[PDB]
Ligand binder design. Structure first.
Ligand SMILES: Nc1ncnc2c1ncn2[C@@H]1O[C@H](COP(=O)(O)OP(=O)(O)OP(=O)(O)O)[C@@H](O)[C@H]1O
Ligand SMILES: Nc1ncnc2c1ncn2[C@@H]1O[C@H](COP(=O)(O)OP(=O)(O)OP(=O)(O)O)[C@@H](O)[C@H]1O
Ligand SMILES: Nc1ncnc2c1ncn2[C@@H]1O[C@H](COP(=O)(O)OP(=O)(O)O)[C@@H](O)[C@H]1O
Ligand SMILES: [Mg+2]
Ligand SMILES: [Mg+2]
Lengths: 458, 173, 52, 512, 170, 52, 460
């Protein structure tokens, strides 16, 4: 009932009769040779023209193809039948298993919960990782973000958090793959199936080889499944493989939609597009979503508008840095930028709070000394400034930890460290009861005991 | 070049001209409007920065023998948007819209030899089977083909020239 | 040293092959232009309109 | 034997093949020409990504279908085109010849050959734009790709179907490392492809002549787009190369592809993108520049046997194919934090970082540990290489850091002294000459000798002599073990005992 | 060369009658919808900054008055709107509930209650856009506003009627 | 090896002179459905023969 | 008959409307009569409707709308070959000297493609320049690009004149000089310094003076290159000197901005890497002859990361640095042996004796620089016998890098010397391994061969 009238890249314009023009976000459909293509409506132009993004390869479109108007949004399989299966952005099954036996389908475009429906919790969630739940502890039903440049441990950290949190989590889990390597997705799927935990995980993949419309909307498909498990009243985990790719796929399309560029060439609507996703990934009085999001930062630039607007949407932010990864220290977390809403005396107790502020105070003071150390070296420092530098270097090394997913790399066995045990270790270093061990003793050890044992082995 | 902005005016004028049965009057009306646009003293005027309303009624005064209730209205709308130089292109697109609606096509026949009437006759039947439309054949004589006949239904071309068959052989080797 | 000589055989073989092919069409051009100024055209166009 | 008859009979076959019955085609006129961009009026039946055939034997690619025109880019010298020329629409989407008959040919990015070796033999055509196999069709990478070089095979191992960025400044050995990888597959049964984007034609001819000098050329396809050629040919050059590599992958064979400068492709796409007035982003590249390199590299994959069976309609059973990619990026002043370097670091499975300070110090190949990594990991190594390498990477990274502070003050505590001696001997042991690849048996002896401590009592100035004598000693007498370790890279206590006896006897009995 | 919302059925209406009747200047039609901006054709009497009423109970603010177009921004969920919907200009600039009964409430920017504690007990409405008191209507600031932070209330005092920027990183 | 190629280069081109005439005639009668009796064509193919 | 009409004039940019069937092709040349002078336009873009956009090869002042434009069906064509030696031309190949009309047996278009893959030389020969510093420390590939990274004050022009002399005498090559964006003053007195040194009969001069509109300066670089292509096609080995490659880049930026194309990178044109590649890829060794090029390079802001340096250094093979300090020592030519480099220094192309010798003298001179700092802070008493031997040989090596040119005889008065590569390798092999330790360092200065150094010593 409509005809294609322009084709620019991934953007397709369609003409309809004046009485029949589609609503915004309705799904259209086209024969592209032997393929079926879905188009999602973005804008209504004058005169029955409607402008759309292709949810598939745009190659091989002529002008003048007949387009069929399906009078509803993109709607995806939802609920308990979606569990242990891999899906397209369009909710089609992508594993070689059969049809998804869904009882219900929901539209991927939804409003966020009302302010009256939100809920708050102080309940600490414990993790295996010394630096994370020392410096940036996070709570059941809250949001966590891992920020970093390329190749600094965003994925390895999220894969440890999957391991460690799934120890004490019983309910279902959702994983949205937005713009990350397919090989990872396949390794993860075989890890989940070979450990039989797959029966509780629902996976949505729109990986980086797919054209822009897939990468933009696949994030929303992942949320829509997690919002069902939440509205059933469960409590749920949502892991998002790289949320930056959603805003970048919006940038790749924006100029073709005829919009003047903003700032560093971004779409003018950047802050609304980010908010309208992030505000529906929340807990509520009926149930709770706990979520970890990876956030790539382009060119290591922590001040680019896309990272900068993402920082406001998160409860715990962990900031990785290349300079620490280059020193071998993993996980390459920066204690002077990583923070949490939950690091309060009332929430975590005074001893934890006081130990975390002690670690920050020492490590900041070590940064203040690096310029004089660079120009003049250490012998011109004050006699307790040498002591600060010796404690700060020991603290830097004791933040490092062996991970069970890094045995393929380190070969060293992995370690899990309880909260009580890590705060005791850092407090003891700051009081100086370990001020006679060498630095190398603190590298890659799970607990302080293991450092004194390693110092016995030199 | 006004090829893209002429479409709305061509379509709107053709629909109205269809409702009121005066298509054949609208075309002569548009042809006169196209011809006033080419005048030496008028094309200087159309480029000047006179106000649109003053410009419109000056053109309307010259455009005697136009359908004062409807033909003038279109010139007024176009001038109000300042697109009168699209009128010679609106004329061609008006002719095209008519040819579509009349289910009638024009196609061109080209050869080195002037065609004998039986050749032209069989072509006309063949094309009217290849198309829904009726065809008015145009004879063009160009020694380029050397031998054979070039069929040119606008964008669609069937080549039957020896030269074409030759320079298509040379690339196979 | 053998592979270097083998490439020269291929390059000579192609070099000559190219020349015979251009001379063939150059011959067919000259043959056709002189010999088709007849009702032979009528033969071609009748087949074309039968195919058309 | 050059034979005149067989040339004549071949022309006779082409004359016999020719079909005189014509076909209706949709036509258009060039309306505008500038900088290799074209605007065409007509072509109502064109499709986006189609090939338009121009006057001459040149083509153009249809980029935009506007309401009343087509925008296209010319794939060649554009300058003799003119407004009003007619253009014809081929129903083909951009296609490239593919097959095993391409091995040993130098070819343009349109698939026409550039060498003198005459017309091509190909097994049909493959599409230049394709979407890679989905997540269920992959398999994990578990087989080695042995390079020539001690440094990368021990510290940064490459598996079949891995993607491994070679990055560094100019004149750091990026190309040398990549062609020495190609040459070492000369006997390993992996087919090779080398794609030269924006390189100097003198350099390209010298590389081809060095591939032929070592006999690797019969196992490589070479794809050329010189620095003189139109930017569209450069931008499409690596996509054409990928389409040939996919032929072997989908038949269950293994192939290796080198892209000689993806930074030069991005510049060419930036030129075309800015000539189409597309609003620029960071460092003036478009946002599509991630999508450009993403869709290219994400085809370098390993596929499971059910994909190969389903693709080849069951003609190949149980085999698994792979395409292994080594993209090269040149980076300014060693800045690993610039935009395009960081885009590609986020697409590949690791990086080998080559440092000009090491290269100028004569440490060649100049691999910087700590930055360099292989996300695939040891799964790419043979057991013996996995066991003998171990922590050698992190020991070298720490030795380099210790040397930095040791330069600054004197605090030498014996174990520091031995750590410095060991690290200095290992770096002197890891440098290696160009075009001198050494097999896994040779590499495993060298690693065994380094980490079982045998280089004790050996001077740094003697290290290169010590190896040259050792590899001649084991070539002379204990040759059968070498043939065993090269066949199956198995590490046993039996083999460790034989290695121990070889190194004990050499150290005790021989001189260097 | 590009079009300017000159489109076929509108032009044909102009062909039928160029001096189209006065009708009502009060109303018009949406011709485009995108990203929460709508373009309206008609509304000859719409004032700049006036509220335009939309189907349902939604509004837009007229921000661009152009040559036969109004650009307006939609104050809510826009994606339900469509081309060819009728719209009517009010007489109204945006006004908000105001009064003492707003204390202890949480409201959206239209002043609708959002805490769920039920309807407001406001004291009439006030214009959202208003002019400040002039130079002769001010008085000097001399009374304190006590922050309770030693560093602020000592070093950086704030008085009644001052405008004190708080600025920093995240 | 190059000098051996030079000798055959002379020999091969002389053979293709005479074979070019056959191929050119065959290709023209492929291109036009009706064949040609060579009535005025001998002088045409002999100029083709002479150039190679 | 003329058939186009000028439709617009906007500064240097001129738009012309031809009939719909006759639209000029890109880079075609057009002529108009601007008053009582002809003006040439080069076509840049075919807009629609038979309108064509061009840039004026001269002042656009006094052009009207409605003039008549005559369509030459070729690009700009210039005279080529021997008749152009010792003449001075502008962009258009018109004589700007007053010696009158050129012989012109032939004229060629300035625009061509580079040599194809089968035309490139299947070998990698060296050029024997005759200069000891260059031929040892920074050898030239035949058909390579060399960058002269030194500021004026240092002998740039005398080095250029010496290369012109040696390649004309000791080979049979000619030279072409392209003054891209040169100050008219320096253009005048470079001509007099060549005429008063007898090298003028062996070089052709094309000058683009800075006071010419941008389109002139861009195309001058191509005018020089097409003349060198003629001498190559005659079978010679040819030198092309480009007086600043940075001014070609900037001329391409200015023209691209006038045409209104979107800028790239640090405000350069989007076509930057293509326009450099279009020049640099024509300068190669073919199977008939070769063009070697020596190109002066200016680095903006002293920044080697800027796109103009970064694009140029992809094409350079050798890199010669000229030093104010070495000139202060009185050592001429003033090449710096430690920052000058060539990627021809490998055993695989230059052989192991030359590689080892060049590596050797580099090591000795580097070690000497460190020892000369120790001497500065602590005097010569700190040096061991090994250190004193290193310092002595380093001073002899430094002295022996000096040479007298046939161009420099005006000052030194010594006869000039051309030194074969073998003789330089013998000399530095000798000095490094401690032969000739028994004769003093001033015997090596400005001498010539090492055989001439000892014969100088015998009465020094
Ligand atoms: N805890 C660790 N121990 C040892 N090595 C590590 C650790 N974390 C990261 N690495 C090394 O650094 C690599 C980069 O981290 P990861 O694999 O998570 O990629 P990433 O930083 O997520 O980059 P991308 O965002 O592109 O996926 C790891 O693959 C591994 O090579
Ligand atoms: N193993 C090695 N030992 C010594 N020199 C080497 C080695 N490998 C390469 N080189 C030298 O490095 C130089 C540059 O080689 P190559 O061109 O491969 O480096 P590159 O960084 O790829 O250069 P470009 O950036 O120009 O492509 C050459 O002189 C080469 O001989
Ligand atoms: N071989 C040489 N002998 C004597 N003087 C020299 C020699 N080479 C350079 N000079 C001196 O160097 C100075 C600058 O040389 P010149 O070619 O004018 O450099 P530029 O032209 O770049 O300023 C002049 O005084 C010149 O005489
Ligand atoms: Mg990641
Ligand atoms: Mg290289």
């Amino acid at each position: 009932t409509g005809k294609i009238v322009q084709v620019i890249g991934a953007v397709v314009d369609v003409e309809f009769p004046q009485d029949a023009v589609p609503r915004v976000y309705d799904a259209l459909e086209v024969q592209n040779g032997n393929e079926r293509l879905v188009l999602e409506v973005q804008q209504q132009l004058g005169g029955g023209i409607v402008r759309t993004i292709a949810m598939g390869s745009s190659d091989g479109l002529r002008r003048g193809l007949d387009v069929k108007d399906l009078e509803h949004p993109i709607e995806v399989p939802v609920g308990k039948a979606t569990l242990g299966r891999i899906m397209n952005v369009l909710g089609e099954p992508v594993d070689m298993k059969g049809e998804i036996g869904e009882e219900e389908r929901w539209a991927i475009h939804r409003a966020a919960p009302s302010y009256e429906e939100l809920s708050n919790s102080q309940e600490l969630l414990e993790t295996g990782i010394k630096v994370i739940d020392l410096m940036a502890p996070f709570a059941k039903g809250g949001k966590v973000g891992l920020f970093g440049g390329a190749g600094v441990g965003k994925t390895v950290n999220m894969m440890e958090l999957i391991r460690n949190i799934a120890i004490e989590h019983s309910g279902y889990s959702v994983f949205a793959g937005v713009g990350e390597r397919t090989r990872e997705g396949n390794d993860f799927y075989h890890e989940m199936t070979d450990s039989n935990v797959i029966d509780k995980v629902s996976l949505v993949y729109g990986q980086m080889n797919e054209p822009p419309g897939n990468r933009l909307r696949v994030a929303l498909t992942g949320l829509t499944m997690a919002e069902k498990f939440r509205d059933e009243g469960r409590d749920v985990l949502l892991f998002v493989d790289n949320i930056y790719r959603y805003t970048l796929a919006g940038t790749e399309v924006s100029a073709l939609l005829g919009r003047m560029p903003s700032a560093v060439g971004y779409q003018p609507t950047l802050a609304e597009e980010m908010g309208v996703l992030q505000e529906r990934i929340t807990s509520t009085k009926t149930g709770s979503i706990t979520s970890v999001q990876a956030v790539y930062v382009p060119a290591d630039d922590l001040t680019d508008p896309s990272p900068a607007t993402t920082f406001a949407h998160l409860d715990a932010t962990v900031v990785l840095s290349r300079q620490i990864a280059s020193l071998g220290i993993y996980p390459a977390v920066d204690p002077l930028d990583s923070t949490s809403r939950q690091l309060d005396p009332l929430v975590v107790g005074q001893e934890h709070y006081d130990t975390a502020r002690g670690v920050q105070s020492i490590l900041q003071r070590y940064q203040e000394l690096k310029d004089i150390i660079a120009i003049l070296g250490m012998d011109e420092l004050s006699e307790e400034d040498k002591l600060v530098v010796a404690r700060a270097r020991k603290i830097q090394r004791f933040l490092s930890q062996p991970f069970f997913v890094a045995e393929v790399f380190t070969g060293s066995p992995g370690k899990y460290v309880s909260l009580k045990d890590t705060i005791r270790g850092f407090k003891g270093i700051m009081e100086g009861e370990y001020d006679h061990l060498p630095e190398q003793a603190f590298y890659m050890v799970g607990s302080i005991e293991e450092a004194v044992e390693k110092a016995k082995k030199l | 070049e006004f090829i893209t902005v002429a479409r709305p005016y061509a379509k709107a004028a053709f629909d109205f001209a269809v409702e009121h049965q005066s298509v054949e009057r609208w075309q002569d009306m548009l042809a006169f409007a196209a011809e006033v646009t080419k005048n030496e003293q008028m094309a200087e005027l159309l480029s000047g920065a006179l106000a649109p309303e003053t410009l419109a009624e000056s053109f309307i005064a010259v455009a005697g023998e136009q359908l004062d209730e409807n033909g003038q209205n279109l010139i007024r709308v176009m001038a109000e948007n300042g697109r009168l130089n699209a009128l010679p292109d609106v004329l061609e697109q008006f002719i095209h819209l008519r040819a579509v609606s009349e289910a009638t096509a024009e196609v061109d026949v080209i050869s080195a030899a002037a065609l004998s009437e039986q050749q032209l006759a069989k072509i006309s039947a063949a094309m009217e089977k290849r198309l829904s439309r009726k065809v008015k054949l145009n004879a063009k004589i160009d020694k380029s083909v050397m031998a054979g006949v070039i069929i040119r239904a606008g964008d669609m071309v069937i080549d039957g020239s020896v030269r074409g068959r030759l320079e298509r052989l040379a690339d196979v080797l | 040293a053998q592979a270097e000589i083998e490439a020269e055989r291929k390059r000579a073989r192609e070099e000559l092959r190219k020349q015979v092919a251009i001379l063939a069409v150059a011959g067919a051009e000259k043959i056709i232009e002189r010999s088709v100024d007849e009702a032979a055209n009528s033969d071609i166009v009748d087949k074309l309109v039968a195919e058309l | 034997q050059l034979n005149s008859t067989e040339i004549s009979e071949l022309i006779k076959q082409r004359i016999a093949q020719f079909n005189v019955v014509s076909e209706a085609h949709n036509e258009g006129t060039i309306v505008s020409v500038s900088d290799g961009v074209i605007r065409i009026h007509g072509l109502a039946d064109a499709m986006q990504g189609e090939m338009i055939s121009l006057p001459g034997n040149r083509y153009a690619i249809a980029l935009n279908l506007e309401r009343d025109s087509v925008g296209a880019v010319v794939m060649g010298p554009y300058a003799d085109l003119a407004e009003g020329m007619k253009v014809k629409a081929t129903g083909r989407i951009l296609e490239v010849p593919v097959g095993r008959g391409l091995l040993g040919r130098v070819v343009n990015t349109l698939g026409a050959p550039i060498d003198g070796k005459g017309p091509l033999d190909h097994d049909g055509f493959s599409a230049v734009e394709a979407i890679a196999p989905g997540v269920i069709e992959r398999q994990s990478v578990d087989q080695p790709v042995q390079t020539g070089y001690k440094a990368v095979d021990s510290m940064i191992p490459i598996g079949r179907g891995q993607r491994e960025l070679i990055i560094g400044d100019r004149q750091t050995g990026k190309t040398a490392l990549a062609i020495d990888a190609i040459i070492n597959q000369r006997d390993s049964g992996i087919k090779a492809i080398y794609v030269a984007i924006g390189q100097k034609a003198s350099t390209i001819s010298n590389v081809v002549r060095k591939l032929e000098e070592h006999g690797a050329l019969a196992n490589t396809i070479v794809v050329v787009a010189t620095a003189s050629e139109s930017a569209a040919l450069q931008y499409l050059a690596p996509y054409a190369g990928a389409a040939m590599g996919e032929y072997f992958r989908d038949r269950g064979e293994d192939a290796l592809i080198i892209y000689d400068d993806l930074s030069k492709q991005a510049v060419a796409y930036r030129q075309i993108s800015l000539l189409l007035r597309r609003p620029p982003g960071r460092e003036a590249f478009p946002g599509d520049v991630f999508y450009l390199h993403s869709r290219l590299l994400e085809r370098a994959a390993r596929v499971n046997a059910e994909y190969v069976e389903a693709f080849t309609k069951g003609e190949v059973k149980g085999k698994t194919g792979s395409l292994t990619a080594l993209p090269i990026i040149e980076t300014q002043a060693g800045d690993v934090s610039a935009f395009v370097p960081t885009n590609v670091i986020s697409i590949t499975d690791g990086q080998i970082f080559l440092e000009t300070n090491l290269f100028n110090a004569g440490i060649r190949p100049a691999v910087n540990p700590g930055i360099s990594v292989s996300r695939v990991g040891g799964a790419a190594q043979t057991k013996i290489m996995k066991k003998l390498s171990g922590g050698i990477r992190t020991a070298l990274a720490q030795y380099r850091e210790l040397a930095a502070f040791s330069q600054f003050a004197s605090d030498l505590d014996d174990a520091t002294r031995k750590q410095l001696d060991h690290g200095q001997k290992v770096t002197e042991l890891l440098k290696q000459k160009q075009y001198a690849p050494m097999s896994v048996a040779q590499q495993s002896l060298v690693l065994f000798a380094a980490e079982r401590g045998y280089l004790a009592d050996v001077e740094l100035s003697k290290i290169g002599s010590f190896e040259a004598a050792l590899l001649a000693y084991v070539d002379r007498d204990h040759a059968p073990l070498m043939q065993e370790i090269n066949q199956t890279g198995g590490y046993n206590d039996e083999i460790e005992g034989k290695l121990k006896g070889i190194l004990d006897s050499f150290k005790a009995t021989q001189s260097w």
